[PDB]
Amino acid sequence: WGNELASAAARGDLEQLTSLLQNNVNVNAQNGFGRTALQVMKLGNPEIARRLLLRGANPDLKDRTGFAVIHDAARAGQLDTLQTLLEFQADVNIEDNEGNLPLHLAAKEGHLRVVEFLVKHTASNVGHRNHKGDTACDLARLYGRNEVVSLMQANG
Secondary structure (H helix, E strand, C coil), X not given: CHHHHHHHHHHCCHHHHHHHCCCCCCXXXXXXXXXXXXXXXXXXXXXXXXXXXXXXXXXXXXXXXXXXXXXXXXXXXXXXXXXXXXXXXXXXXXXXXXXXCHHHHHHHHCCHHHXXXXXXXXXXXXXXXXXXXXXXXXXXXXCCCHXXXXXXXXXX
Protein backbone atom coordinates (compact mmCIF):
# COMPACT_ATOMS: atom_id res chain seq x y z
CA TRP A 1 0.00 0.00 0.00
CA GLY A 2 2.59 2.57 1.07
CA ASN A 3 4.82 1.64 -1.87
CA GLU A 4 2.01 1.33 -4.40
CA LEU A 5 0.29 4.49 -3.19
CA ALA A 6 3.51 6.48 -3.62
CA SER A 7 3.97 4.89 -7.03
CA ALA A 8 0.45 5.88 -8.14
CA ALA A 9 1.03 9.46 -6.96
CA ALA A 10 4.48 9.71 -8.55
CA ARG A 11 3.13 8.52 -11.90
CA GLY A 12 0.13 10.82 -11.71
CA ASP A 13 -2.29 7.88 -11.86
CA LEU A 14 -5.40 9.20 -10.08
CA GLU A 15 -7.46 6.13 -10.98
CA GLN A 16 -4.94 3.78 -9.37
CA LEU A 17 -4.48 6.08 -6.36
CA THR A 18 -8.19 6.20 -5.58
CA SER A 19 -8.40 2.41 -5.95
CA LEU A 20 -5.56 2.02 -3.44
CA LEU A 21 -7.28 4.50 -1.14
CA GLN A 22 -10.21 2.09 -0.88
CA ASN A 23 -7.91 0.00 1.31
CA ASN A 24 -7.05 0.79 4.92
CA VAL A 25 -3.80 2.56 4.09
CA ASN A 26 -1.55 5.03 5.89
CA VAL A 27 -1.18 7.91 3.45
CA ASN A 28 1.83 9.04 5.48
CA ALA A 29 3.67 5.76 4.99
CA GLN A 30 7.11 6.08 3.39
CA ASN A 31 8.21 4.19 0.28
CA GLY A 32 11.40 2.25 -0.38
CA PHE A 33 13.41 5.47 -0.20
CA GLY A 34 11.78 7.36 2.68
CA ARG A 35 9.35 9.56 0.76
CA THR A 36 5.58 9.71 1.20
CA ALA A 37 3.05 9.61 -1.62
CA LEU A 38 2.47 13.37 -1.31
CA GLN A 39 6.21 14.11 -1.41
CA VAL A 40 6.77 12.13 -4.62
CA MET A 41 3.50 13.12 -6.23
CA LYS A 42 3.80 14.05 -9.89
CA LEU A 43 3.17 17.79 -9.77
CA GLY A 44 0.48 19.18 -12.03
CA ASN A 45 -1.95 16.68 -10.50
CA PRO A 46 -3.72 18.77 -7.82
CA GLU A 47 -6.50 16.19 -7.31
CA ILE A 48 -3.83 13.66 -6.31
CA ALA A 49 -2.65 16.06 -3.60
CA ARG A 50 -6.24 16.77 -2.58
CA ARG A 51 -7.15 13.08 -2.16
CA LEU A 52 -3.99 12.45 -0.14
CA LEU A 53 -4.58 15.52 2.03
CA LEU A 54 -8.22 14.52 2.58
CA ARG A 55 -6.88 11.25 4.05
CA GLY A 56 -4.63 13.03 6.52
CA ALA A 57 -1.41 13.47 4.53
CA ASN A 58 1.17 15.66 6.34
CA PRO A 59 2.12 18.44 3.89
CA ASP A 60 5.06 19.80 5.92
CA LEU A 61 7.39 16.80 5.63
CA LYS A 62 10.88 17.44 4.21
CA ASP A 63 13.08 15.19 2.04
CA ARG A 64 16.81 14.42 1.92
CA THR A 65 17.41 18.12 1.17
CA GLY A 66 14.98 19.69 3.60
CA PHE A 67 12.45 20.49 0.85
CA ALA A 68 8.69 20.21 1.45
CA VAL A 69 6.35 19.46 -1.46
CA ILE A 70 5.22 23.08 -1.42
CA HIS A 71 8.85 24.04 -2.10
CA ASP A 72 8.80 21.75 -5.13
CA ALA A 73 5.41 23.07 -6.24
CA ALA A 74 6.61 26.67 -6.07
CA ARG A 75 9.88 25.93 -7.87
CA ALA A 76 8.00 24.12 -10.65
CA GLY A 77 5.43 26.89 -10.89
CA GLN A 78 2.64 24.41 -10.17
CA LEU A 79 0.05 26.83 -8.76
CA ASP A 80 -2.95 24.47 -8.51
CA THR A 81 -1.05 21.96 -6.40
CA LEU A 82 0.46 24.77 -4.34
CA GLN A 83 -3.00 26.15 -3.63
CA THR A 84 -4.56 22.82 -2.66
CA LEU A 85 -1.52 22.40 -0.41
CA LEU A 86 -2.37 25.63 1.40
CA GLU A 87 -6.10 24.96 1.67
CA PHE A 88 -5.01 22.00 3.80
CA GLN A 89 -2.92 24.08 6.20
CA ALA A 90 0.49 23.57 4.60
CA ASP A 91 3.02 26.04 6.03
CA VAL A 92 3.66 28.75 3.40
CA ASN A 93 6.75 29.86 5.30
CA ILE A 94 8.46 26.49 5.57
CA GLU A 95 12.21 26.87 4.87
CA ASP A 96 14.67 24.73 2.95
CA ASN A 97 18.21 24.06 4.21
CA GLU A 98 19.37 27.44 2.91
CA GLY A 99 16.64 29.53 4.51
CA ASN A 100 14.58 29.82 1.32
CA LEU A 101 10.78 30.04 1.43
CA PRO A 102 8.57 28.71 -1.36
CA LEU A 103 8.41 32.41 -2.32
CA HIS A 104 12.18 32.52 -2.96
CA LEU A 105 12.00 29.47 -5.21
CA ALA A 106 9.07 30.72 -7.29
CA ALA A 107 10.70 34.15 -7.51
CA LYS A 108 14.09 32.73 -8.50
CA GLU A 109 12.41 30.67 -11.24
CA GLY A 110 10.30 33.53 -12.55
CA HIS A 111 6.85 32.05 -11.88
CA LEU A 112 5.02 35.37 -11.78
CA ARG A 113 1.59 33.92 -10.97
CA VAL A 114 2.81 31.75 -8.11
CA VAL A 115 4.63 34.76 -6.64
CA GLU A 116 1.56 36.98 -7.09
CA PHE A 117 -0.65 34.45 -5.30
CA LEU A 118 1.89 34.04 -2.50
CA VAL A 119 2.38 37.78 -2.03
CA LYS A 120 -1.30 38.72 -2.34
CA HIS A 121 -3.16 35.79 -0.75
CA THR A 122 -0.88 34.02 1.74
CA ALA A 123 1.04 34.79 4.93
CA SER A 124 4.34 34.44 3.06
CA ASN A 125 7.03 36.57 4.72
CA VAL A 126 8.06 38.75 1.78
CA GLY A 127 10.92 40.31 3.76
CA HIS A 128 12.43 36.96 4.74
CA ARG A 129 16.19 36.83 4.09
CA ASN A 130 17.64 33.40 3.37
CA HIS A 131 20.85 32.31 5.12
CA LYS A 132 23.00 34.25 2.65
CA GLY A 133 20.99 37.39 3.32
CA ASP A 134 18.80 37.41 0.19
CA THR A 135 15.03 38.06 0.05
CA ALA A 136 12.84 36.45 -2.62
CA CYS A 137 12.90 39.75 -4.53
CA ASP A 138 16.71 39.86 -4.25
CA LEU A 139 16.89 36.45 -5.95
CA ALA A 140 14.40 37.43 -8.65
CA ARG A 141 16.64 40.42 -9.29
CA LEU A 142 19.76 38.25 -9.32
CA TYR A 143 18.18 35.85 -11.81
CA GLY A 144 16.94 38.60 -14.10
CA ARG A 145 13.26 37.96 -13.37
CA ASN A 146 12.30 41.56 -14.20
CA GLU A 147 8.52 41.12 -14.13
CA VAL A 148 8.66 39.28 -10.80
CA VAL A 149 10.77 42.12 -9.39
CA SER A 150 8.30 44.73 -10.66
CA LEU A 151 5.33 42.85 -9.20
CA MET A 152 6.98 42.32 -5.82
CA GLN A 153 8.00 45.94 -5.19
CA ALA A 154 4.54 46.97 -6.38
CA ASN A 155 2.90 45.23 -3.43
CA GLY A 156 5.50 44.75 -0.72
